[PDB]
Structure 1
Amino acid sequence: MNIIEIKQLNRYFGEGENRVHVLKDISLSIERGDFVAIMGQSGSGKSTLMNIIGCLDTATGGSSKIDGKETIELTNDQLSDLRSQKFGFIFQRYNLLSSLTAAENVALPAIYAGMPQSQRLERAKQLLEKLGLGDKWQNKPNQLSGGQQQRVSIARALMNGGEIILADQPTGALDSHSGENVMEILRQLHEEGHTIIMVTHDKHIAASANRIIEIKDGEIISDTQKRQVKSAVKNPSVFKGKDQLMEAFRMSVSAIVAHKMRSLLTMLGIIIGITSVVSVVALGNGSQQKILENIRGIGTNTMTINLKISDANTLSKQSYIQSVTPNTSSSGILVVGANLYGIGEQYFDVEGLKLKQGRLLTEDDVDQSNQVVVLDESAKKAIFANENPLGKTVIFNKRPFRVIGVVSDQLNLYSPYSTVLNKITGGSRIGSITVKISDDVNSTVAEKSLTELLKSMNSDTIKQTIENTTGTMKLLISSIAFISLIVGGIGVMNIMLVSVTERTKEIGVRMAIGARQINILQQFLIEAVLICLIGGVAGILLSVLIGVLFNSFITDFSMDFSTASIVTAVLFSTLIGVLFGYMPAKKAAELNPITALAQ
């Protein structure tokens, strides 16, 4: 029977007293196949009605039925089907996409329908040929006159060959010639079985119509028909219960290339949120190595202890003891022109004394009980003043000694324990045994692991301030990485929330021309991940370049990276940049297109 059935349709805008009655109990039925022209004074509710017909708005009250199916009760996907294939809409203000070409803007509604890309541009190019724009098929909207942009919008509405053709003032900016051709086009579509509902003010245009309604003050005044209307059985239906993503991907790349700034800035906000978190973790762990190393080098940790060399020999065969020293001293007199410490092979490693000049007590010296002495930094300057002491001799208890090297501090003389127990004091008993406990093993554990291992005192203030300042450096690195991470995240959020919501109009258009709710989320997720995992890649390998640059010029300490921070910094900056690139696009795609088109 009818194709559109409106009854008791009311419409309101505003809050009240700021509220206005815009469509008042208007009841209208349009007969399938008609050519209806709507006329009225500016701001009388015409466009408001057209939107509720084309499923871009939703009336406050009353019924509206397309092919007898109540529109409000349809589902969201069902409604999108109507806007894609039943309705072809010519927007008053032409509502193109400013980044797409003429042809691209025409074929857009056909992508969500689902025809091959090759078929689209040829048709879109032909629609522009009919409407006199074949010369300008590549120009973008802002490279076209208003009248041309209008005809572009016309071609779009005819791209999917929709049954109904809602045309809100489709001639407004067109000359008589261009305008007549458009009416030639619309007439021939009426003649081929199409339904036309056209708002206009030009009477010559309204002449091409069979029926002419007049609206005024939200109510319907006139109703005129020249002829009766041929009958027509309704078309079958347009309801659709992989390639969809191939297209979504192509759209998202183009979009990204179109908005070079927004895109570049966005990925650049992700780039930093990664490298900043990564560079402080690696600068933090780098300055912790040096600081702890500078503390370990201020002295060692040792455990001074029937104690024969075979005890200190097996003591050195552990992995929780890295060096050992048998000990024995002597108090006598020296001569050139005191204390002679009888020490072990590794004593200069057990106490951290470092070699200044010459060499230290080798293994041959302790085996043969050599009469060789290593001098203390102090006792070396006092005896020899500023002259080289290497080789020259000293006399301890009328017994020669050949100076072989100098060491640092914490008169003192260091000779083997075999030479003090054979050539200075005699006897076989030694004073004590000293061991250098490893840096990793626990302190109080070894103090009881040596009591056990020998039966079969210790100084550890460095080993304390090490563990004490490693807990401090932890809290520092840990709490500045947390800042930089929360910083760079809110950095992505801000630039993502802005650059996305700044295209809520674009969704409103896409929804008006057929796209389904999911079609939007597809290309906006693809837009995010595609811009986030390129910013991510650029991120992990921009901090690399920074490390190299740093480790090259900087000498104090090195920037050592942590693959945990890399992961955490990337998986966080993208998990947050994708969430805020999706959330806004979704909230827009679920708005009534006209409410999305008024932003």
Structure 2
Amino acid sequence: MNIIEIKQLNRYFGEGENRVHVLKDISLSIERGDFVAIMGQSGSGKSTLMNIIGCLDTATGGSSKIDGKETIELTNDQLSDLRSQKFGFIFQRYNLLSSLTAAENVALPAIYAGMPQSQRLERAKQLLEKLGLGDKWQNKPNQLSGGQQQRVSIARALMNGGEIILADQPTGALDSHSGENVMEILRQLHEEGHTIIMVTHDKHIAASANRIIEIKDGEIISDTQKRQVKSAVSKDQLMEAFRMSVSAIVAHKMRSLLTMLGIIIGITSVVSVVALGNGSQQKILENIRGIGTNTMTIFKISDANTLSKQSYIQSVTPNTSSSGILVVGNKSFTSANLYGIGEQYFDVEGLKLKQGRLLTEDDVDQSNQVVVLDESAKKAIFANENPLGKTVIFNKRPFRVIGVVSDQLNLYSPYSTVLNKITGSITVKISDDVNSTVAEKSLTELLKSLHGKKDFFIMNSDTIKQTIENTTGTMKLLISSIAFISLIVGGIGVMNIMLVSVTERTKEIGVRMAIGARQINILQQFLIEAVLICLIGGVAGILLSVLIGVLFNSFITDFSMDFSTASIVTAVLFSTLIGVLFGYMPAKKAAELNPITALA
């Protein structure tokens, strides 16, 4: 019976005193397959009514029903169908996508309908033939005249062959020839049973309509008919969406490259400060560990034998000293010290080999008369001359100098040599990883298991092992809070550049919604636009930092940038989960507001 039925239609804009009554109790039924012209004075409400009909706006009050179905009660996808297949909208200001060619702009409504791309380009091209722009099918909107852009808009409206054609001043910018041809087209679609509702100011145009409504001040003045009326009788979706996203990204080279370089940094920063931090910790903790060791002085040799058979004890020394008199040259250095020490004593106290060698196993087994010299008691006795080989005399008893060591007269001989050839404790080096007060109570246990009840007045020096654990806690807090900054820094960095760049195309959404796209079709390409730009700039990131590391480890002597694979994951899994969230969120808020509101 009727195709459109608008009863009691009201429409307001604005917020009193800024509010205006724009459509005033409009009641209009349009007959199926009619040709209708709407005329009126500039700013009377004509475009506003056209939008509510084609489901771009929605009225403040009153019913509007397409094929008798109330539009407000329809679902958001149900509406997006009407806009793809029921309506075909020629916009007043033509609303083309500026990055697309003419042809591409025409075919676009037919992606959301889901026709194969080979068919689209040929049809779109034929629509531009019929309308006179077969010449310009490759031109983008801003390479066309206004009247050309207008005809591209007309083409697009005709692309999905919608039953109803809403034409809002479709000849405004065109000569009478071009304008007639366009009327020719519209007339033929009327003849093929389409329904035409056309806003116009030119009367010659309005004559091609059988019905002519006049609007003034939001109300309906005229209603004229020449005759009576005739009676009436997601898988590929994503392949396409991906293609959309890519050309979208290539079209906006700047926005894209900056967005992606935004994420690149918010990775390489976080990663390069985690790896700078752990590199300087290695060196700082090492500079401390090399200042002296941590040991437990027990102040027989089978005790110190099995003491050395742990993994929580790294080295062991039997100890025994001697107070006596040395001789070299004429000089006779009185009250010298000959420390009878173990195989591994130079490990246990971390003394470093300067010159020659240290006490081998053969020397302690044979009670060899060989002495390793203290740096200070080496230079004093031998001036600046090689002391290797040359002899000393401790208590009228020769000793062959076999090497020199670091500091903390001191002389180091085997314990077997001092208990055999000079006179007749047990120190252990507690491991770096094991806990200090654990081992103080692990050694109490493990030795008392060798019966002897005492004297376990066991002393142990562990102030290095303290100020390591003390400065590892400080270096953790530093690296941890520095990473937490640099991460929050370049997450906001991404959010800014993302929030801007996507909201910068909320009109592009409003167009896509008006020409048939369904809510989710938006979210498809805007997710794909994000992930595609996020996991390129991710890959760029992880391997840009790598290159920085190589540059740093090359030029930097002091410490090495040592990476963490945990940070790499964290930084990437963060900087994309944030960039995708802020690529989606704004696109989704756009696609869900009324197309016209998006269009401004």
Give TM class, smaller chain.
Answer: over 0.9
Residue 365 of structure 2 corresponds to: 367
Deviation per CA, 1:330-369, whole angstroms, max 9, x where unpaired? 1111111100111111111110110111111111111121
1:262 to 255, 260, 266: 255
Decide which moves more: 358-367 or 89-98. Answer: 358-367
Instruction: Name the CA distance, whole Å, in 1 between partners of 2:578 and 2:444.
Output: 56
Instruction: Give 1:324 shift.
Output: 0.8
Superposition pairs for residues 566-581 of structure 1, below 5 Å? 566-581=568-583
Deviation per CA, 1:184-221, whole angstroms, max 9, x where unpaired? 11111111101111111111111211111111111111
Instruction: Give 1:513 shift.
Output: 0.4
Instruction: Give 1:94 shift.
Output: 0.3
Instruction: Name the CA distance, whole Å, in 2 between partners of 1:451 and 1:379.
Output: 37
Deviation per CA, 1:541-566, whole angstroms, max 9, x where unpaired? 11111111111111211111111111
Deviation per CA, 1:418-457, whole angstroms, max 9, x where unpaired? 11111111xxxxx911110111111112122222222221
Instruction: Name the CA distance, whole Å, in 1 between partners of 2:428 and 2:45.
Output: 97
CA RMSD for the aligned pairs?
A: 1.3
Instruction: Name the CA distance, whole Å, in 1 between partners of 2:141 and 2:66.
Output: 32
Instruction: Name the CA distance, whole Å, in 2 between partners of 1:86 and 1:65.
Output: 13
Instruction: Name the CA distance, whole Å, in 2 between partners of 1:199 and 1:227.
Output: 20
Deviation per CA, 1:356-401, whole angstroms, max 9, x where unpaired? 1111111111112111111111111111111121111111111111
DSSP 3-state at the match of 2:460: coil
Deviation per CA, 1:557-598, whole angstroms, max 9, x where unpaired? 111111111111111111111111111111111100000001
Instruction: Name the CA distance, whole Å, in 2 between partners of 1:219 and 1:202.
Output: 20
Instruction: Name the CA distance, whole Å, in 2 between partners of 1:382 and 1:560.
Output: 43
Instruction: Name the CA distance, whole Å, in 2 between partners of 1:445 and 1:212.
Output: 98
DSSP 3-state at the match of 2:562: coil
Instruction: Give 1:14 shift.
Output: 0.6
Deviation per CA, 1:248-267, whole angstroms, max 9, x where unpaired? 11111111111111111111
Instruction: Name the CA distance, whole Å, in 1 between partners of 2:266 and 2:441.
Output: 49
Instruction: Name the CA distance, whole Å, in 1 between partners of 2:163 and 2:306.
Output: 98
Instruction: Name the CA distance, whole Å, in 2 between partners of 1:291 and 1:18.
Output: 69
Instruction: Name the CA distance, whole Å, in 2 between partners of 1:447 and 1:176.
Output: 104
Instruction: Name the CA distance, whole Å, in 1 between partners of 2:30 and 2:85.
Output: 18
Instruction: Name the CA distance, whole Å, in 1 between partners of 2:440 and 2:207.
Output: 108
Residue 79 of structure 1 corresponds to: 79
Instruction: Give 1:155 shift.
Output: 0.4
5+ unaligned residues in a row in structure 2: which ranges?
330-335, 450-458
Instruction: Name the CA distance, whole Å, in 2 between partners of 1:410 and 1:153.
Output: 89
Deviation per CA, 1:93-146, whole angstroms, max 9, x where unpaired? 000001111110000001111111111000000000111111111111111111
Decide which moves more: 354-363 or 44-53. Answer: 354-363
Instruction: Give 1:530 shift.
Output: 1.2
Superposition pairs for residues 65-144 of structure 1, below 5 Å? 65-144=65-144
Instruction: Name the CA distance, whole Å, in 2 between partners of 1:591 and 1:320.
Output: 68
Instruction: Give 1:83 shift.
Output: 0.6
Residue 300 of structure 2 corresponds to: 308
1:414 to 383, 390, 412: 412
Residue 396 of structure 1 corresponds to: 394
Deviation per CA, 1:280-315, whole angstroms, max 9, x where unpaired? 11111111111111111000011111x921211121
Instruction: Give 1:496 shift.
Output: 1.0
Instruction: Give 1:274 shift.
Output: 1.1
Decide which moves more: 410-419 or 440-449. Answer: 440-449
Instruction: Give 1:517 shift.
Output: 0.8
Instruction: Name the CA distance, whole Å, in 2 between partners of 1:484 and 1:415.
Output: 56
Instruction: Name the CA distance, whole Å, in 1 between partners of 2:39 and 2:300.
Output: 118
Instruction: Name the CA distance, whole Å, in 2 between partners of 1:442 and 1:209.
Output: 95
Residue 454 of structure 2 corresponds to: none
Decide which moves more: 469-478 or 443-452. Answer: 443-452
Superposition pairs for residues 300-339 of structure 1, below 5 Å? 300-305=293-298, 308-337=300-329, 338-339=336-337
User: TM-score w.r.t. structure 2 length?
Assistant: 0.96
Matched residue count: 584
2:235 to 236, 242, 255: 242
Instruction: Give 1:271 shift.
Output: 1.1
1:479 and 2:470 correspond:
no
Residue 277 of structure 2 corresponds to: 284
Instruction: Name the CA distance, whole Å, in 1 between partners of 2:236 and 2:300.
Output: 85
Instruction: Name the CA distance, whole Å, in 2 between partners of 1:455 and 1:217.
Output: 107
Deviation per CA, 1:505-532, whole angstroms, max 9, x where unpaired? 0110000000111111111111111111
Deviation per CA, 1:461-512, whole angstroms, max 9, x where unpaired? 1111111111111111111111111111111111111111111001100000
Instruction: Name the CA distance, whole Å, in 2 between partners of 1:19 and 1:443.
Output: 79
Instruction: Name the CA distance, whole Å, in 1 between partners of 2:100 and 2:93.
Output: 17
Deviation per CA, 1:48-87, whole angstroms, max 9, x where unpaired? 1100111100111111111111111111111111111110
1:521 and 2:523 correspond:
yes
Instruction: Name the CA distance, whole Å, in 2 between partners of 1:391 and 1:322.
Output: 31
DSSP 3-state at the match of 2:461: coil
| 4+ long deviations beyond 3 Å | none
5+ unaligned residues in a row in structure 1: which ranges?
233-240, 426-430
User: TM-score w.r.t. structure 1 length?
Assistant: 0.96
Decide which moves more: 197-206 or 81-90. Answer: 197-206
Residue 513 of structure 2 corresponds to: 511
Instruction: Give 1:45 shift.
Output: 0.6
Instruction: Name the CA distance, whole Å, in 2 between partners of 1:15 and 1:507.
Output: 26
Instruction: Give 1:459 shift.
Output: 0.6
Instruction: Name the CA distance, whole Å, in 2 between partners of 1:28 and 1:494.
Output: 48
Deviation per CA, 1:145-181, whole angstroms, max 9, x where unpaired? 1111100000000000001110001111111111111
Instruction: Name the CA distance, whole Å, in 2 between partners of 1:61 and 1:447.
Output: 85
Residue 436 of structure 1 corresponds to: 429
Instruction: Name the CA distance, whole Å, in 2 between partners of 1:23 and 1:122.
Output: 41
Deviation per CA, 1:22-44, whole angstroms, max 9, x where unpaired? 11111111111111111111111
Instruction: Name the CA distance, whole Å, in 1 between partners of 2:13 and 2:47.
Output: 14
Instruction: Name the CA distance, whole Å, in 2 between partners of 1:575 and 1:448.
Output: 49
Residue 470 of structure 1 corresponds to: 472
Instruction: Name the CA distance, whole Å, in 2 between partners of 1:373 and 1:557.
Output: 37
Residue 238 of structure 1 corresponds to: none
Instruction: Give 1:5 shift.
Output: 1.0
- Percent identity over paired residues: 100
Decide which moves more: 529-538 or 341-350. Answer: 529-538
Decide which moves more: 452-461 or 50-59. Answer: 452-461
Instruction: Give 1:242 shift.
Output: 1.3
Instruction: Name the CA distance, whole Å, in 2 between partners of 1:65 and 1:320.
Output: 85
Instruction: Name the CA distance, whole Å, in 2 between partners of 1:443 and 1:227.
Output: 105
Instruction: Name the CA distance, whole Å, in 2 between partners of 1:44 and 1:463.
Output: 86
Instruction: Name the CA distance, whole Å, in 2 between partners of 1:41 and 1:320.
Output: 96
Residue 177 of structure 1 corresponds to: 177
Instruction: Name the CA distance, whole Å, in 2 between partners of 1:309 and 1:555.
Output: 45
Instruction: Name the CA distance, whole Å, in 2 between partners of 1:122 and 1:573.
Output: 42
